[model samples]
Target: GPVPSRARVYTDVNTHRPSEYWDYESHVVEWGNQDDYQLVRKLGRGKYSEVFEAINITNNEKVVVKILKPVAAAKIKREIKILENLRGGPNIITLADIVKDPVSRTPALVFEHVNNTDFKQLYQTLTDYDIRFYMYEILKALDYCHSMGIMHRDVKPHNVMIDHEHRKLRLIDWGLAEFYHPGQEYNVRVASRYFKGPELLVDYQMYDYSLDMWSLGCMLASMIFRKEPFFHGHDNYDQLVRIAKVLGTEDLYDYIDKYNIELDPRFNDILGRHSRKRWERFVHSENQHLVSPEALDFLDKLLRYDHQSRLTAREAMEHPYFYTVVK
Candidate 1:
């Protein structure tokens, strides 16, 4: 739908900044010498990049080498520009160096490596306070990026690197991030299936930073509820159905109506009217300690059908759920 809608907060963030700050396509990157770093081992691979554990030869320090796949030049520039602009922001990953293979012109970003434990293993081990501490840490990163006029379109457990030993959290993977401009229509195909906001599901393009809040809610919900993905869906279309099953179809319809959104006809057959599930119903003996009243209220505010109703990252930091760990 082309129904115009701006962010509830930070609507003019990019407008207040210089053109050079948001004009990523014009940014020329200075390529570094790939020889300065050596790949120690392959860490992971994504559709757009291959990650490797690497070492900086000059300083003998460990780093992560993200070898970008063949993608649009504009996209590569966007990621670099956003990262450079957010260099010193709280809990944001440090872009240590940018290198490329001269022969292939294959670009790679070198980042300071964190000794991360896998979320599947780590989430189970985190105490109530540890979860609150880390969730707040990620919010700091989100708030910092939003303040700097950037939207981290992707926010998932995989992108949040946590070093529990040092109690450090770094938000990584800026490839999907973009500078937020008021009333600008953005691509709906941004976040992962399980963490996608209802705005994306309903084909709403005029979304903003609040989209990340939904993803964060989804992440937090999964952790506290002991569900790997609180809203598990098999495919894109089913994703909405899964969300509807939890958030209720009536509120979703109201949200769409407010934005003058016309849902895809595919939803006609598969989507059924559903009642909203209570957050308290998800609490079990095993996860009860992590699901306090404040935690439920926090999740309720974040996992709303209306994007404008969702709490901003900064506002979320002030929520009662974080009272014990705000420092």
Candidate 2:
């Protein structure tokens, strides 16, 4: 209803790039033979893809075979194009090859495998220094993607693959990522409910790379507070409620008003007003080691109600909290 806002940084990234780079529909995919890859075992499964540990018989190297579910052909291409675009970027998952079953016509994406441990157990073992180190690595992936005019709409713990022993992190699952064009109204139906930003919960379509920062803040909060999910929302509507409980309802309304956003009427019954909880309150005996003045200051900037106010991934990497961690 009003003028749409743009990202604070990397606003013109796609605009300055050639159309061939962002044009996914026009790109031709050269599918590899599925015979070259042999599935070792099932690794995991998601709504869109079935993942497995596989062997790239050509070079005898281990790889991941992501057998994509039957969906819009354009979607599969978009993921492939994005993966190609972000190749070689710091901490980015490398897409090794694209394959398809000849008879069934099922497509799969082959990627370099990282020995990843499940976050359920891994998060429990990370020290404060480890958290900072890995967070800095995640920021590198975000900064690189945003710099390339790409927005990783799905930024969550599940998408981040960490091999702690090797000190390696790869931002995987590019299926939900999209190329960012300034002034473009994007779909708000992206990212997980718990990690969704205020703009997403309020149904704001004119969002940008800053959306990833909000999700990153949620991940950081969960890690530092020892809560599996920082915002424990039962549903999409309640997701904002969970956030409001911590950040307060007043600022939420202020943000909505500022953007001329008319929130869904569904919030009327459940959206009770709440006062913002201080960051210090979450710090106690359990997570005190992970809490520090610098860490809290950094978290504050990332979890702002206004997307424009949140730190850019590049800016986040430079925050004082990473002063000792960044090399």
RMSD of each: 1.2, 1.1
Tell how far residue 156 is off in model 2, in angstroms. 0.7
lDDT tens string, model 2, 1-327?
A: 855899989888877888989999999998888999888999888889888899999899999989988899888899999999999999999998998856447788999999987787678989999999999999999999999999999999999999878999999999999999888898899999999999999989999999999999999999999998999999998889999999999999999999999889989999898899899989989999999999999999999999999999998988899987849
Question: Which lDDT tens digits does candidate 1 get at residues 244-325?
Answer: 8988999988888998999999999999989999988788898988889998999999999899999999999999999999
Estimate TM-scores for all models.
0.97, 0.98
lDDT of 1 at 326: 50
Off by over 4 Å in 1: 102-104
How far residue 279's Cα lies from its native spot in candidate 1, in Å, is: 1.2
List the candidate 2 regions with Cα displacement exceeding 4 Å.
none
Flag clash pairs in model 1: none
Q: What's the TM for model 2?
A: 0.98
Q: C-alpha displacement of 101 in model 2, angstroms?
A: 2.1
Judge candidate 2 at residue 285 and give its lDDT.
99
